Design an enzyme around this catalytic site. Structure first.
Site, mmCIF file in Angstrom:
data_model
loop_
_atom_site.group_PDB
_atom_site.id
_atom_site.type_symbol
_atom_site.label_atom_id
_atom_site.label_comp_id
_atom_site.label_asym_id
_atom_site.label_seq_id
_atom_site.Cartn_x
_atom_site.Cartn_y
_atom_site.Cartn_z
ATOM 1 N N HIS A 1 0.569 -1.208 -0.244
ATOM 2 C CA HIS A 1 0.098 -0.317 -0.266
ATOM 3 C C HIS A 1 1.021 1.588 0.070
ATOM 4 O O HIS A 1 0.366 2.264 -0.427
ATOM 5 C CB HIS A 1 -0.478 0.501 1.253
ATOM 6 C CG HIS A 1 -0.465 0.258 2.086
ATOM 7 N ND1 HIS A 1 -0.193 -0.309 2.734
ATOM 8 C CD2 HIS A 1 -0.225 1.549 3.732
ATOM 9 C CE1 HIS A 1 0.494 0.409 4.356
ATOM 10 N NE2 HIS A 1 0.433 0.844 4.265
ATOM 11 N N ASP B 1 -0.829 -7.723 0.738
ATOM 12 C CA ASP B 1 -0.520 -6.418 1.396
ATOM 13 C C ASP B 1 1.260 -5.930 1.356
ATOM 14 O O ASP B 1 1.722 -5.340 2.624
ATOM 15 C CB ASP B 1 -0.910 -5.455 2.238
ATOM 16 C CG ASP B 1 -0.553 -4.441 2.872
ATOM 17 O OD1 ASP B 1 -1.342 -3.520 2.169
ATOM 18 O OD2 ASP B 1 0.150 -3.825 3.592
ATOM 19 N N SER C 1 4.117 2.703 8.417
ATOM 20 C CA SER C 1 3.214 1.731 6.786
ATOM 21 C C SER C 1 4.306 1.116 6.297
ATOM 22 O O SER C 1 5.648 2.065 5.744
ATOM 23 C CB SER C 1 1.991 2.013 6.392
ATOM 24 O OG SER C 1 1.193 2.168 7.041
#
Ligand SMILES: N=C(N)c1ccc(C[C@@H](NC(=O)CNS(=O)(=O)c2ccc3ccccc3c2)C(=O)N2CCCCC2)cc1
EC number: 3.4.21.5
Lengths: 259, 36
Positions: free
Chosen positions: A43, A99, A205
């Site tokens: 992502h 992901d 992230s």
């Protein structure tokens, strides 16, 4: 990282940060797995709803850092990426399943005191370390709290942040979210009651969840920061890519397209 | 100095290879042996 500390210098050598090249912007963290392969979440690169689809020429990888602001002559290696690889079965349109993404540099990096590999996990170490209550460590330079998006957000770490969070058991992870949770993710953070707090947040992230083995005294990447509702809300857990259940893949690409 | 592919790993230089331990390290170890 919500409730992290300032990190000791050279604390997580594997810590890479993704920048967008122009305009300059921290995008995500990542890990240095080898002298030319940086692991990250899918992502940071591809999330079509927010028109995010980042080409190889859009990004730049800063390795060896500690300050977020300062260019540091002595420590720091800026590479650029040859290839951006993202999983076929990265399911953005539902639940961020699979992901993961893997970036080949243009140019191998020379390791230093301050720039050095993560171990990826093996059958025995996954099976031995991934138990509920076992604390791992998440790092990065992202938001110190959940924030309304202004450009100068104010909440931005000076120095890289570290926190240590318990792995939580799957029923409880499942129970905390309406979003369909799958077998290649795990969650972590404190229960309500447990005295203590912590989370990753925006810009952490892509970065490592690592655990350290008492066998041979080395560090392994169990997880990658993938998602969650907010940063550090009661009854909500942080969710991480289960690196090992995508290890069978983790090998395969570096060994398919190899030379 | 040598180069190669991904090799020894996971021991940080300025910690494991110096035999020093970092600030927070002791929480993880204490959680471990508090489980199994
Ligand atoms: N551990 C944390 N508290 C944590 C972890 C990661 C982040 C960054 C991360 N943002 C979020 O997860 C925002 N929370 S979200 O709005 O609940 C969200 C958004 C879209 C989703 C799509 C698929 C699956 C789950 C989703 C979760 C992000 O940039 N993403 C890119 C956009 C899709 C979602 C992930 C923030 C907080």
């Amino acid at each position: 990282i919500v409730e992290g500390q300032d990190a000791e210098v050279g604390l997580s050598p594997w810590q890479v940060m993704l920048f967008r090249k122009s305009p300059q912007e921290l995008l995500c963290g990542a890990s240095l797995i080898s002298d030319r392969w940086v692991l990250t979440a899918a992502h940071c690169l591809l999330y079509p709803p927010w028109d995010k689809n980042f080409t190889v020429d859009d990004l730049l990888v800063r390795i060896g850092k500690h300050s977020r602001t300062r260019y540091e002559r002595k420590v720091e290696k800026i590479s650029m990426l040859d290839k951006i690889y993202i999983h076929p079965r990265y399911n953005w349109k539902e639940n961020l399943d699979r992901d993961i993404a893997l970036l080949k540099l243009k140019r191998p990096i020379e390791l230093s005191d301050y720039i050095h590999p993560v171990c990826l996990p093996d059958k025995q170490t996954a099976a031995k370390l991934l138990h509920a209550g076992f604390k791992g460590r998440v790092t990065g330079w992202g938001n110190r709290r959940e924030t309304w998006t202004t450009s100068v957000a104010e909440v931005q770490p000076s120095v890289l942040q570290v926190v240590n969070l318990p792995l939580v058991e799957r029923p409880v992870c499942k129970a905390s979210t309406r979003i369909r949770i799958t077998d290649n993710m795990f969650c972590a953070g404190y229960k309500p009651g447990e005295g203590k707090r912590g989370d990753a947040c925006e810009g952490d992230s892509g970065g490592p969840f690592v655990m350290k083995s008492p066998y041979n005294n080395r560090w392994y990447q169990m997880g990658i920061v993938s998602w969650g509702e907010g940063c550090d809300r009661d009854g909500k857990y942080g969710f991480y890519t289960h690196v090992f259940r995508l290890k069978k893949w983790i090998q395969k690409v570096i060994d398919r397209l190899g030379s | 100095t040598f180069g190669a592919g991904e090799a020894d790993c996971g021991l940080r230089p300025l910690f494991e290879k110096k035999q020093v331990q970092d600030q927070t390290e002791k929480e993880l170890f204490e959680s471990y042996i508090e489980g199994r």
